[PDB]
Amino acid sequence: APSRNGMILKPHFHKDWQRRVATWFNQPARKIRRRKARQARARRIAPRPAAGPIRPIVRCPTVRYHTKVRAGRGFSLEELRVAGIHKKVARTIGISVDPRRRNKSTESLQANVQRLKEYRSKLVLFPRKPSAPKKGDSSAEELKLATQLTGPVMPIRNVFKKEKARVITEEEKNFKAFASLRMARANARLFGIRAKRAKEAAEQDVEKKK
Amino acid sequence: MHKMLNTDLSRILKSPEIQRALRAPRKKIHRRVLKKNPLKNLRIMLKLN
Amino acid sequence: PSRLRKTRKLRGHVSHGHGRIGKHRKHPGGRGNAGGMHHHRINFDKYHPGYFGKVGMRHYHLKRNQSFCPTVNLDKLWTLVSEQTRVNAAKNKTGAAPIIDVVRSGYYKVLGKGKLPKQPVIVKAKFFSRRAEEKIKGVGGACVLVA
Amino acid sequence: IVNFVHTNLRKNNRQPYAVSELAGHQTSAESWGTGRAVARIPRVRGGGT
RNA sequence: GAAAGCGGGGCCUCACGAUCCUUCUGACCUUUUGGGUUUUAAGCAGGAGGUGUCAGAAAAGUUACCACAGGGAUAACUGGCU
RNA sequence: AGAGUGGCGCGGACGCUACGCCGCGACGAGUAGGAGGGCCGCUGCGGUGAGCCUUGAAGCCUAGGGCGCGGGCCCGGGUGGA
RNA sequence: ACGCGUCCCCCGCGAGCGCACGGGGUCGGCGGCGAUGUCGGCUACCCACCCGACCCGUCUUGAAACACGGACCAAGGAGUCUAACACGUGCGCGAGUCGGGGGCUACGAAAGCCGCCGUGGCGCAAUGAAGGUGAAGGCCGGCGCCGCCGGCCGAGGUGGGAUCCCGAGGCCUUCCAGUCCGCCGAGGGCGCACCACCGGCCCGUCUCGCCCGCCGCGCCGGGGAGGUGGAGCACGAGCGCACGU
RNA sequence: CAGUAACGGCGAGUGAACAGGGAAGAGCCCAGCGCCGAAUCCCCGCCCCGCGGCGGGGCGCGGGAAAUGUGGCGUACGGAAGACCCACUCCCCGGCGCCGGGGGGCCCAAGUCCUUCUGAUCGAGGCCCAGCCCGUGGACGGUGUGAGGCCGGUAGCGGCCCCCGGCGCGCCGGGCCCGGGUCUUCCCGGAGUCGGGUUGCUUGGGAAUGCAGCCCAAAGCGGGUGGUAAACUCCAUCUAAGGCUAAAUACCGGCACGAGACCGAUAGUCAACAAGUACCGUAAGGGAAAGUUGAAAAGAACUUUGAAGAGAGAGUUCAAGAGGGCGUGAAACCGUUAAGAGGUAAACGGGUGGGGUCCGCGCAGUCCGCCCGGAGGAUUCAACCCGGCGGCGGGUCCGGCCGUGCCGGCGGGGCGGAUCUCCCGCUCCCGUCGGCGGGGGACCGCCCCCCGGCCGGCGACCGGCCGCCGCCGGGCGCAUUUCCACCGCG
C-alpha cells in the first residue's frame, strides 16, 4: 500500500532465490591459490618469460573506443610472412598465432611488421645441447647475462603526436563549422531522391524527339 | 591540515587584544523577595511613600 | 545496532506500535502494486502521472555505442590542457594560438555555454553546435573538424 | 576518526556462523483442529512412544 | 443590418463515457536497423466504435449428505423500553 | 572609575567533571501513538582496573542492616565448593 | 521653609558615637532520666480498631458482569536477517569522487601497496515519438535603414532582507585651550542566504514576414517578430562510509 | 554493460546480448579428388629375454580380415607434382650406473632449591653487585587447586634411520632417411539434408528466437547471415548437414585435516549415554526419554533389635550436612516446633496503637583553632657566612635552534609540464631535400641541500655568565627566642 510520494519499484524475488544464493567466503584463500599455482607456472618454464607469447597491436572497434589501442589475440598470416618468420616456427619462439585476422589498412600493417623485428633482435636463444651449439644460436655471455622477464612483453601504451601554437591563415577563419555539417547531411540523405528525377526529366526529352 | 591553529584557550583569553573589547562583569547575586504587607508593617510602608 | 532501535522501548507495551483496534495483519491492500486502476487509483495518478500507456516507436537490437556523444561547454573549454599553453600565449606579439584537441580528452561534440577567456585558439571538435562556432570566431579562432 | 574507524575495521576478520534449517522442521507433524480441547498447534503424526 | 452591433448551438438550471486494441482524417511529415528505388508495417495530432454495477471484471444453479474462518456489528427463545 | 603637553608585621574560605556550577518566573490528567534520558537489568568481543578469589568464587536461603520516585542495587549471617 | 558671592520676573570629600515594625531565626535561656533493665530504631515479621476499597487480561459507544482465557509452580516463549527506495543526521574528500573485481608481497580469512590497474558507476545538459537540435547581452565610431568593420564592460532589475561602513554631535572634578586611544550616536551608504514581482537564453509546437550562405545553385542549408508544452539555462554540491525512521 | 533494449488482460509482472576491462590461454583429425605392386591390420605353434599396466626380437609353404577399400603423404591458414635456386646432421621407443620432494617411525633447554597456608598445592614471600634458570621453546593438555623451568609436546634451512618417485649425464640396445624460397601445369570437399507450408511447445526476439512431428523438398558466379512482410538491386562477412582437445569454473555425498566476537544437556543434529536404539503400525512409514559420589573405593570389619526390608551404636573421609540414578539442591505442595491470632470467604490502601525479633555494641556524652594564667620537657629560634637546586627578564650580555615567514646567489641536486629544438635509430626518394620515432640540450613550475641579508618564536620548541628573591642540607647562635606533651566549669 503506497503511503504517499515515493518511487514505484519492481523486485524479482518471486522465485525461490534462497535455494540459489552464491557467497564468496572463499574469496581470500582462493586468491592465495592462484598466486601459488601462478608461482608454480614459471619455475617450470625457466628463462622463458612468464609474460608468455607476445600479443599484437590491435584497436578497439566502434565509434566509442575507436580512438584506443590494446593487446590482441594473434599476428595475421601476412605480418609473419613479410617479416621473415614461418607460422609453425613462430609458435616455437614466443610470437602469437591466430588463423582469422585481417589486413584492411596499411596503417595497422606496417605497425605489425616492425613489431616482430624488435622482438626477433632482442631475443636470447639457447643451444640444443649445452656442449654443441650451431649458427643462429646466441653466444655464452648473453646466455650468462640472460634471464626471465616480468609483465607483458613490450607493452602497448596510449600514444598521440603533439602539435604547435599556430597563426591562423585568412581562409581557416573563413570556413563555416555548422553550415558545412548541415550541407553534408542534406546531400547524403537526398541523393536517392536526386538521381531518379534527373533521370525522369531526361527520360521525357528522349521520347518527344523520337 | 588544522581547523583551529591554537587550541591553547587558557592563554588566548588573556593576550592584549581580547581584554580590550568586552564589558565588565556582574558577580552579584539577587535572592528572592518576601512581600511584607505594607498595610501592616511600618518601615516597609515608609519606603513606598 | 539491535540496541538503539525502537523495539527495546516496546518490551512492555501491548500493541507494539501497530494498534489496539485494527491490528498488524498480513496484507490489507493486496501485495505489491495492486489496485492500479481500482482502489489504489488516486495515489498512482497524483505522484506518477503517465504510468499507464504507450508512446513512440520501438527500436529492437539497440547497440548503444553508435549513439555515443560526449560533451564539452565553452566557459570551461580551457579545461583540457596544462597551465602553460595560456600564460605564454597571452605574452605574444606576432599573435600565436595553441591547438586544443577535444578528441584527446574524451569529448566528441563541443557545446556553447558561457564566456570565453579572450585570446587566440584553434579548436578541433567532432561536432560544433551553432554557438560554439560564433563565440570562438568573434573573439578570433578557427573551427577544424574531425571524424 | 579513530573510534569510528576502529569499530568498522574490527568486523572484517570475523568468521561466519549459522544455525541449521533442517532442525525443527525434521518431523511429519500436523494440527488436530478445533475440538478435543487442545491448543491448535501442529502435533506429531501417529505413535506409541 | 443603413449603421451602432450581435453571433463560436438551442433564453438559464440535466440529456452522458478512461488504459489497451479497431476505424477514419490531416502533410513534398518521422521511422522502416549496412546503403538506395518501389509495395508494406510502425508513429504524431484530431474525430468515431463503450463500458447504464455509468473512475469503466469477460460469468448460471442446487445441497435435509455437507465443510472452514468468524459474527451477538445479523435473525430463530427469555428479559428489557414501547 | 581615561593617558599626557601649555596658563614595625611578607598575610586575604569555598570554586570552574564549562558535557560544570550558579541565578529569577509559569506551569505539571491522559487511552491509540510519538519522542528523550536511564550511575535501570541479561549474555558474548577489544581496551583498561600493578581489580578481586582455597585466610573461601558462583548460586541459594535469611522474623539480620542500608540505598533510589523507579527499574533495581550496597552490606551482616549461613550454605556451597572454583 | 533657616549660611553667603552675583543672574531674575514679582515689588559637588564636615567629625564621630547610638536605637530600630528596615533586602526569609536567633537566645551572650533553662530542667529531668541514666548498666542487666531500661534508651532509641520511620524501615521488615505477627495481631487490633476507624475510614476506604467488586478480578485480572480483553474486543468493545458500554465489562465486577448471566460476554470469553486464567487450579497452582518452574523452565522456554513472539517486529528479525538480507534486497531495493526515500527523507533526516554524523564523517572524509570536493567538480569531482569510489577499487567494491583483478594484481604484488600464531593474531592474518587481517593489514600497506598499485595509477599508463578509473575499464566502469553515480555526477557536471536539456529536450523531441523521431530525424535531430542543444543554453546573455549592451554602448560609441567606418557605409534616418539595412550588410559588415573596430574600441570598452559585462552574467540584468524593483520591493523586503541577519550584519558591516561613513559620522552632525557629545562621553564631568578647580577653570582656559589642545590631542591621541576607545565607546555612545540623529539620520544617511554596499545590500550574504530565503522569498514575492517584473525581463531574458536553450529544446518542442503554433501564426506573420523579409533578407542571407554556397567545391555540388536545389522538393539544398542558415537568420528574424509574437503566442505556447517541458522532469531545462541563469557562476556549480555532488560522490564514498555510518546511524536512525 | 542494466533492472537497460525487448515482452506483457502493455496489468500484475518478467528480461538479454555486443562493445570495454580481468582470470585462464593451445590448438588440430578424417570422409572426398588422386599418386605409392594392401605397402595395412588381427589370432595361433615354437625359443631367447621378460613384465603382478602381457610388452621386446627371431622362425613359420600357419590360419583369417580386405578392392562393397586397409595404411602412408594430405583437408580451405589452401594442397600436389615437375623444373631452377638456397642448404643438411638432430628426432623419438626401453634398460645399466652416475647427480638433492611425498609417506612412516625413533630422538633433542630450564627449579619440583629456601621459608610458608592446605586434606592435598600448580598458591603467598624470597633467591645479591649476571636483578634464581631457559627463552628459535611464555600454544595446548595432563598431574590430590590456579605450572614457561614435574610429565607429553611447543621452537629450528634441527638430528638419525627406511620406503618410492622427479628432473640431468654417460654405455650398450631399438627404431628414423626426412628441410625452405621463385617459375610452369594440374585440383578442390558431407542429401530426405539445406529450404519452405502448416500444427504444438519454447524465448526478451516483435508478419514467428530455438525445437519437433506430417506434407512439399533444392542449389554450384552456389549456399547461410545482416533483429518488420516482399519485389526489383550493389556491398559486407562466415563455409552449415563428420570427429578429438588442457586451463581458468562448480562440489550440503565420500576420505583426512585446521578454526571460530556461535550453542551449552527443555540448548546445540532426531541422536553428549547399548539411537535411527526401546516401542507403535498388516505395510508405506512414524520414532523417544535418558550427562555429574570422591582426591582416591578408603563403597561403612565387630557388636545389637528383627523372619525380612527398615533401624541403634562402632568406623573412612577435609565432609556422608558426599551412602552406589550418590556436585550444588530454588519454587509449588506436605509434616512437625514457636509465636501469634480467629462468628460477616479470604486478601488489599491510608492512619495509629500493642507485642515480638534482632540490630545500635547504646547506659553520665562532641570535637578544631587562636588567645590568658599556673606546673614542667628538647639543646632550639632570629641573623651571618658554607655548598647544592628551582621560580624569573638582564626594559639594551653571548651564541644556537627552529618557521602554515620572505629577499638574494653568475651557488650543488630530485621528480614534475597538453613549453621550445642539436645527435641518431627506421622509412619513401634519387653521397641528397623531405617524414614519423628512440635519447640529450635550453626554458617554467614544485622541492631537497649549502652561503649571505632582513622578520617572528623558546607557553606542542633551549645551553652559559650576571642580578634578584625561594626552598633544603652544614657550621655557628646558648636563651623573657623556637616547639613539644599536660593541666584551668579562664
Beta-carbon separation of A177 and C145 below 8 A: yes
Q: Which residues of A touch C144 (CB under 8 A)?
A: 172
Closest to C69 measured CA to CA, from C103, C21, C20: C103
Q: A166: burial class by Cβ within 10 Å (0-12, 13-18, 19+)?
A: middle
Work out the minimum CA distance from C56 to partner chain A, whole angstroms.
22
The cell for A196 is: 531518379
Q: Rounded distance, CA A78 to CA C61, Å?
A: 35
Q: Which nucleotide shows the minimum CA-to-C1' distance to residue A84?
A: H181
The cell for A61 is: 572497434
Q: Which residues of C touch A4 (CB under 8 A)?
A: 43, 47
CB atoms within 10 A of CB C133: 21
* Residues ≥6 apart with Cβ < 8 Å to C115: C74, C75
Sheet holding C143-145, edge to edge: C99-101, C122-125, C143-145
Nucleotide H172 C1' to residue A89 CA (A): 35
The b-or-e profile of C83-104 (16+ CB within 10 A means b, else e) is eebeeebeeeeeebbbbbbbee
Q: Rounded distance, CA D30 to CA A33, Å?
A: 50
Residue of C nearest to A163 (CA): C99
Closest to C143 measured CA to CA, from C117, C115, C122: C122
Q: Rounded distance, CA B26 to CA D29, Å?
A: 82
Q: Which residues of A touch C44 (CB under 8 A)?
A: 2
Q: DSSP secondary structure string, A79-91?
A: THHHHT--HHHHT
Nucleotide H3 C1' to residue A12 CA (A): 9
Q: Rounded distance, CA A94 to CA A54, Å?
A: 6
Beta-carbon separation of C28 and A1 below 8 A: yes
* Beta strand segments in A23-160, E: 57-59, 69-71
Q: Which residues of C touch A180 (CB under 8 A)?
A: 145
* Residues ≥6 apart with Cβ < 8 Å to D15: none
Mutation target among C63, C65, C119 for the A interface, most CBs of A within 10 A: C65
Beta-carbon separation of C143 and A177 below 8 A: yes
Closest to A2 measured CA to CA, from C34, C76, C137: C34
Q: Is A88's CB less than 7 Å from nucleic acid strand H?
A: yes
